[PDB]
Amino acid sequence: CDDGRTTANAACCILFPILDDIQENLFDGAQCGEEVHESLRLTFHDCIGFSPTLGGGGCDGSIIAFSDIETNFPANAGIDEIVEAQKPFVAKHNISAGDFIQFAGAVGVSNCPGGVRIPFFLGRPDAVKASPDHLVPEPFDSVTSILARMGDAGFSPVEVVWLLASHSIAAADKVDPSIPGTPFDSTPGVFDSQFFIETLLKGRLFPGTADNKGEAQSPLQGEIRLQSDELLARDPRTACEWQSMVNNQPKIQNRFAATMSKMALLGQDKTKLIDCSDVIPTPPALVGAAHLPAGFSLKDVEQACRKTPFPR
Ligand code: HEM
Ligand SMILES: [Ca+2]
Ligand SMILES: [Ca+2]
Ligand SMILES: [Ca+2]
Ligand SMILES: [Ca+2]
């Protein structure tokens, strides 16, 4: 390649001006802030719009291409601004929206401490059609409906748990509109196991207004809990996997990267793409060991796995 850098394949040098723009003009100087949290989420809301029988283009960038339609899906509340945030970048550069969505996601994760380098591929065509509605899992859906939807897209129950490691770097804006920016765990700027830990704590309070659609009771003030994350943490089909995450940053990193790659290829083929994983920067180290919040004991944690009691 040219000024600065060089990578395994020549067509990957195009990503580097892109890499520079989004770190400064989208990620606030390569930080793990809100825009990073929304780009990661965006990859899912684009890709999960796929079903072998119901339709959808998958990771086709349709959520940007047909933002008028898809950003007004009820399940896409609050996505319309990461779309408009990424649009000027899609406009100036010559990669497809499908490619850019995944790149911004991958690059963004590597800005977060404890993060991982997700494999990124280049060459997706432009979006042909808008995704059908009702393909995006809602936080008030049952475990069965979530697992069936993710399963219909080709994800096993354990894979769903793995992909939900994303909630370690996450916050909600539309669940409780009164308290926007309330994170899913106590360490939203760090990619750790604190999400799986605090989810297993018992419900104690509502951080904002009284229960509204998709919200379960939170353990901590300044933290919000989705109704879907609470159930998945306790459901026999996934409880043991959810608890196994509270243990293992290596596994968390390992599994989050292997499945995101699988997700990013939904309806896209292999050989038509080229590999530019070389481009993704390397995340900083983990900033502290796992722990229960102050004032909490191992009793405060709910047990949902019958095989192995919650590991101290
Ligand atoms: C499987 C069922 C899932 C459900 C029901 C769900 C639900 C939600 C909801 C309701 C929000 C907050 C929306 C708002 O800001 O108002 C959220 C945030 C987020 N989700 Fe999920 N999600 C799921 C899976 C995933 C997956 C597979 C990923 C993969 C990357 C992911 C990544 C994220 C991220 C990064 C955020 C933070 C958004 C922000 O900070 O604004 N989620 N999720
Ligand atoms: Ca799509
Ligand atoms: Ca639903
Ligand atoms: Ca975290
Ligand atoms: Ca206490």
Author numbering: 3 to 314
The authors write:
Versatile peroxidase (VP, EC 1.11.1.16) constitutes the third family of ligninolytic peroxidases, which was described 20-years ago. VP combines catalytic properties of the above two families due to the presence of both a Mn-oxidation site and a catalytic tryptophan in its molecular structure. In the present work, VP (isoenzyme VPL2) from Pleurotus eryngii has been subjected to protein engineering using a rational design strategy.
A third approach to improve the stability of VP was the further structural stabilization of the distal Ca2+-binding site, responsible for maintaining the relative position of the distal histidine involved in enzyme activation by H2O2. For that, the VPi-ss variant was designed by adding a double mutation (A49C/A61C) to VPi. The two cysteines added to this variant should form an extra disulfide bond contributing to the structural stabilization of the loop containing two of the four amino acid residues that coordinate the distal Ca2+ ion. Finally, the VPi-ss structure confirmed that the two cysteines introduced at positions 49 and 61 form an extra (fifth) disulfide bond next to the distal Ca2+ binding site. This region did not show any additional change compared with the native enzyme even though the two new cysteines occupy positions adjacent to Asp48, Gly60, Asp62 and Ser64 involved, together with two water molecules, in Ca2+ coordination. VPi-br harboring seven additional basic residues exposed to the solvent, and VPi-ss containing two cysteines added to form an additional extra disulfide bond, further improved the stability of VPi at acidic pH (respectively). Both variants retained 86% and 85% of the initial activity at pH 3.5 after 24 h of incubation compared to the 61% retained by VPi and far from the 1% of the native VP. In short, the extra disulfide bond contributes to stabilize the position of the distal histidine in helix B. This analysis, together with that previously performed for VPi, could explain the accumulative effect due to this disulfide bond and the extra hydrogen bond and salt bridge interactions on the VPi-ss stability improvement observed at pH 3.5. However, VPi-ss did not show increased stability at neutral pH compared with VPi, unlike what was observed at pH 3.5.
